[PDB]
Design a protein that fits this description.
By secondary structure, this protein is mainly alpha-helical. The chain has one helix at about 1-10. It is rod-shaped and about 70 Å long. It is classed as transport protein. Keywords: Ion channel, Ca2+, tetramer, transport protein.
């Protein structure tokens, strides 16, 4: 029964909550905002 439960539940990898160790990531941006609106007419072509 142990082997049957194993090979009939675990390989499916569904219906059971699965955990994994992942790394924290963070994103930063410069104080730059580029949106189309009235005024500040920009061709919106930037190099980085």
């Amino acid at each position: 029964n142990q082997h049957l439960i194993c090979d009939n539940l675990l390989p499916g990898r569904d219906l059971l909550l699965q955990t994994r160790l992942v790394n924290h990531v963070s994103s930063m941006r410069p104080n730059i905002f580029l949106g189309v609106s009235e005024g500040s007419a920009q061709y919106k072509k930037w190099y980085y």
